[PDB]
Symmetry: C4
Subunit: 245 residues, 4 copies
Amino acid sequence: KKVIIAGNGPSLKEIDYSRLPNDFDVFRCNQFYFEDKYYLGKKCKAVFYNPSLFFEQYYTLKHLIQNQEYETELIMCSNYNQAHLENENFVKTFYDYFPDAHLGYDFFKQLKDFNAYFKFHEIYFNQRITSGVYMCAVAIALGYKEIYLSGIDFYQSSYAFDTKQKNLLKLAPNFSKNTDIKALEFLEKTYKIKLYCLCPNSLLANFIGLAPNLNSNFIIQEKNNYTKDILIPSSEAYGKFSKNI
Amino acid sequence: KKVIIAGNGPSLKEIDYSRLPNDFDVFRCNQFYFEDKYYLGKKCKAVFYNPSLFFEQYYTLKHLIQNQEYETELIMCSNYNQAHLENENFVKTFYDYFPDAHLGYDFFKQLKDFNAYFKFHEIYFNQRITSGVYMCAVAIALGYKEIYLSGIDFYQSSYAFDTKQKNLLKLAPNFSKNTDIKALEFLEKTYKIKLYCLCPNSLLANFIGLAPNLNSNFIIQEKNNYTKDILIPSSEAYGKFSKNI
Amino acid sequence: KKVIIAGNGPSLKEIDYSRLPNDFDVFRCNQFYFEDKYYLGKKCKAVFYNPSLFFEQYYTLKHLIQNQEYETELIMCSNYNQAHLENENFVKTFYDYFPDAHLGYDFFKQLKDFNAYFKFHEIYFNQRITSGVYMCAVAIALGYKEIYLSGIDFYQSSYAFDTKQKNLLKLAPNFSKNTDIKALEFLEKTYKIKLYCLCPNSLLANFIGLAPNLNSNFIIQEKNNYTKDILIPSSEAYGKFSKNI
Amino acid sequence: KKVIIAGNGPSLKEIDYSRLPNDFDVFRCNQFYFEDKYYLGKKCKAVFYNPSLFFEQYYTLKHLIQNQEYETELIMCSNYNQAHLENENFVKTFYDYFPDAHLGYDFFKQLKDFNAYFKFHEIYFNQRITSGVYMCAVAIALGYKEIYLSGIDFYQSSYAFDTKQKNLLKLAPNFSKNTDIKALEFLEKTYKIKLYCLCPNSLLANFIGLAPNLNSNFIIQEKNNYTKDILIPSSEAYGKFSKNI
Ligand SMILES: CC(=O)N[C@@H]1[C@@H](O[C@@H]2O[C@H](CO)[C@H](O)[C@H](O[C@]3(C(=O)O)C[C@H](O)[C@@H](NC(C)=O)[C@H]([C@H](O)[C@@H](O)CO)O3)[C@H]2O)[C@@H](O)[C@@H](CO)O[C@H]1O
Ligand SMILES: CC(=O)N[C@@H]1[C@@H](O[C@@H]2O[C@H](CO)[C@H](O)[C@H](O[C@]3(C(=O)O)C[C@H](O)[C@@H](NC(C)=O)[C@H]([C@H](O)[C@@H](O)CO)O3)[C@H]2O)[C@@H](O)[C@@H](CO)O[C@H]1O
Ligand SMILES: CC(=O)N[C@@H]1[C@@H](O[C@@H]2O[C@H](CO)[C@H](O)[C@H](O[C@]3(C(=O)O)C[C@H](O)[C@@H](NC(C)=O)[C@H]([C@H](O)[C@@H](O)CO)O3)[C@H]2O)[C@@H](O)[C@@H](CO)O[C@H]1O
Ligand SMILES: CC(=O)N[C@@H]1[C@@H](O[C@@H]2O[C@H](CO)[C@H](O)[C@H](O[C@]3(C(=O)O)C[C@H](O)[C@@H](NC(C)=O)[C@H]([C@H](O)[C@@H](O)CO)O3)[C@H]2O)[C@@H](O)[C@@H](CO)O[C@H]1O
Ligand SMILES: Nc1cc[n+]([C@@H]2O[C@H](COP(=O)(O)O)[C@@H](O)[C@H]2O)c(=O)[nH]1
Ligand SMILES: Nc1cc[n+]([C@@H]2O[C@H](COP(=O)(O)O)[C@@H](O)[C@H]2O)c(=O)[nH]1
Ligand SMILES: Nc1cc[n+]([C@@H]2O[C@H](COP(=O)(O)O)[C@@H](O)[C@H]2O)c(=O)[nH]1
Ligand SMILES: Nc1cc[n+]([C@@H]2O[C@H](COP(=O)(O)O)[C@@H](O)[C@H]2O)c(=O)[nH]1
């Protein structure tokens, strides 16, 4: 079946909606909820978060669902089983702290040839795929055959929204393209799936062919008084989770 | 099949016995044996104890069985796989120290949606279900469909008995309602089971409908010269178990 | 099928051979090879050694087999998964250091009720079964139905041989009955097997009925120039095994 | 089916090619690529590397494949699950750092009798088989029935090539026969396979019968401007792998 995978680059705001497939699931990641409109609707099949902020993102996502801003069926942590990248205890105890979520690596590792591809480039050449590509690998492992890409701009404005929000900055004060492109080519060739681009003005469209025009319609709902920053758990909550950070 | 789940609140002494089901199993917990009469009989299907006193409670239970005060088929430890709540070595080595007992979490975790529900409230909001509710989740995991509740009073006298006994005080010198009520509602709705209340005068009866009057009979046997305090193992026994405390 | 289980008490020298069963396997333990005659033949189905001397006993057994003194099909370590009794790394790495041997606990633990029985008495009352009884439990787990006992004397001369040998003393300078008797009664009743005694003059014969007289014959071969002390591995070998001691 | 197993001794240069089997797979190890000609072709079924240099050898092998110098289907690490021989974290995390490779021990250990044979000699007598013999055991575990040996000379010039290369010396400045011979005899007798020698002038041919002359042909391709030293990863790569070295 068919999936739309969305990064959070500026092209998220410039999807050509006549090229949307007839039916589909949606994958989102990281600060997706910062978007000022529902560019791909409220309903997610899966959302993906990095280990470094998973504790805060899970808490924030439960707020989004309760407040009827989004829904999702799956919740994934984008990990790799690498000591230099992730806390060992966090991975070991994951299913006991977050019983309705999944370690993304449990799916990523089912693609042996791609896992090998990723590890060689990360360890020896310091070349790492982004979340956009990570989500593609997980979709392929779950059985999707046609993947439609949006919001992937290779960092050239940084984002489809203003990302410099108070709480996020408190947690992460920090707030090439070859790596992602070669990885997508490998996935397509190795696993016999099809990639499409939904964003004609994106740099991605230079490398990946456009989804065909099907005269599809889509209503873009605007958002108001919405959650536009990550939420920060209590000091007692951090105390309980402190081995895993 | 049918189960009666008993906490140790004052309502344990005020069961309406005409509402007992036609056939049933009984679950008890913690200091249940402090009761001055056999309010639910001598025969237990399962008994539940917290990790913090399991070593002493297991020793005490073997005395109760040998002395013909109670019998039980199952022995459960009420754990959650949470580092802030339980000793890691205790859980790791449990089946080798207590081969005829079970970790309650081995059953609790089979209810994925409830495990997620519990963990979110405990970790982020410092809201924890009590043993009464824990036993309900385990019963549901074991296949019970009709659950009859007693001895659940939400701590307002503290107990159906005087709990301030010498040994217990030596081990634990320490000797809201929304959390338990919302959790029971979730269990009932999610797993399609039925909850009943056996205690008409209890606060519980404001939230959970009464078991129907079936004109049942029950003989309440009085107790004499009985074990009414926890027993304390030898210093040599503590020495052997010291990694797990 | 039928098994003869032998301890190393003085009664090993006073078997009534007319009571030997028509066909059988033999279990031996610890310093059995110190015997001055082949009281039960050269062929063992299994030999059992304690964790504390396993490293040296395994080395010694390979010498016995090469020198054509004994043979055995199985090699067992008599462990319990108890931190106060055995080195944790020794158990964890056992199958990689001794690939043709077994941890006895892998069989012992298949008898859940007896494992529980043993652990309760050891941990809380400092009452421990001996190797003789351990071997019985393992035989029952392996499917034996009729067990014939010898060399079990409850330590009242200590042994059927002089145990005060140079190397053994170097490794272990140290070189009641109720516990073993109650444990054997439990095994017999719980698992529905039959116990017999082969040694009419033993204290054991006061508690366990004699094997029936079948007019069987047995040739007792004498031993000469034989291995009558444990062997000590090189200092380099100890260096390699030092985490496990 | 049929396999040629090659060590890197001087006899690698003196194969009698009329004795090559009609069809076959090839196993190579360690510094095989230092060879000045393709003595057994470019195509390997498997290549084997020691834990001590695996990090650098894997990196080097990926270069060889990209540069079209060799190909291989399998990549094996020649380990034994022994603390004195290999880094514990290296083994624990192996499949996550090298997803397209295998721990050789996962196959070696399938030969229980040989694993026991190896461990006894290594631990107690400081007698260790070489990589040549290790590869034979792995071939047998994978189902091969006829094994053809080359490049096994028992270290008497050291090698079929000059091994004193700059990078290798930087990583390993260090750059009897009874053990290997008795181990090969054990493998042959125990697992019912056939061993042949391809090198008539080798010391091996004194102990193992020659492969029959089949009038086979083989073209020995010369090598030019080829990789003749191990490659050294960046300091950043070592930083990431530092727990495993
Ligand atoms: C991108 C980079 O290398 N940044 C360097 C910093 O490294 C980051 O350090 C963090 C410390 O908690 C985390 O370990 C980051 O690791 C993750 C993460 O964010 O959790 C691991 C994820 O698996 C990975 N996600 C994917 C899909 O690959 C993310 C991801 O790469 C992004 O967050 C990167 O923007 O990273 C880890 O990247 C740090 O060493 C500083 C030095 O102090 O240098 C930065 O250059
Ligand atoms: C209730 C509470 O938070 N009390 C606080 C103390 O926390 C207790 O500390 C104990 C130290 O050994 C245990 O870790 C207690 O944890 C358990 C337990 O009793 O073993 C874990 C059980 O899984 C849990 N049982 C259930 C069914 O949820 C029990 C249970 O919640 C009751 O025993 C609570 O009455 O707790 C742990 O609760 C401690 O931090 C002191 C500070 O020193 O503050 C108390 O407020
Ligand atoms: C018998 C006793 O309690 N002796 C006390 C000593 O305890 C011994 O300490 C040893 C130190 O390496 C071992 O841990 C002994 O544990 C075993 C063993 O010999 O390996 C564990 C075995 O599972 C057990 N075998 C069986 C079949 O039960 C043996 C066995 O009980 C006999 O070896 C006992 O004679 O023990 C452990 O028993 C030690 O604490 C000294 C104090 O320094 O006090 C002794 O009383
Ligand atoms: C051969 C020997 O005993 N050399 C002694 C040194 O021991 C070497 O130390 C290394 C330190 O990183 C490694 O642990 C070597 O272990 C392996 C290896 O090279 O990785 C383990 C492999 O499984 C083994 N391979 C096979 C197929 O058996 C190799 C192999 O034996 C060869 O590399 C040996 O030439 O060894 C380990 O052997 C070291 O203790 C020095 C003292 O400082 O003394 C040397 O005699
Ligand atoms: N300018 C951008 C911002 C994000 N992306 C993609 O969106 C994904 C989510 O953004 P982030 O920076 O939070 O990882 C990111 O991993 C890339 O796949 C991009 O391609 N170009
Ligand atoms: N006053 C009371 C005392 C106990 N209970 C219940 O009885 C259970 C056992 O009592 P305890 O305090 O030992 O956990 C407790 O977990 C609650 O479920 C109660 O509801 N009200
Ligand atoms: N005097 C003795 C000596 C040994 N035994 C038995 O022989 C077994 C082996 O002797 P040992 O002391 O090495 O554990 C021992 O465990 C007992 O089961 C005995 O019963 N009486
Ligand atoms: N002179 C030699 C060199 C190597 N070998 C064999 O070649 C194998 C690979 O060589 P190496 O030294 O890297 O382990 C080695 O393990 C032996 O099996 C040999 O037999 N004689």
